[PDB]
Amino acid sequence: FNVKQKSEITALVKEVTPPRKAPSKAKREAPIKYWLPHSGATWSGRGKIPKPFEAWIGTAAYTAWKAKHPDEKFPAFPG
Fold this sequence. Notes:
The chain contains 2 helices and 2 strands. It is elongated.
């Protein structure tokens, strides 16, 4: 959906057909609907965290973002 609030979920052991569990860095996060059409992206493998993106997409852009959507994005500062 276009209006759909956030979900940030912790890393899990990998999906594989036989019983052999690889230690996968799994990150499942929503950033912004203005840049990506689905906010809620699953990556099992490379350690992606969209906090330096969502922080610079909020440092000044949050006042224009709040006119475009109600409070869909997580209110992040650069820290």
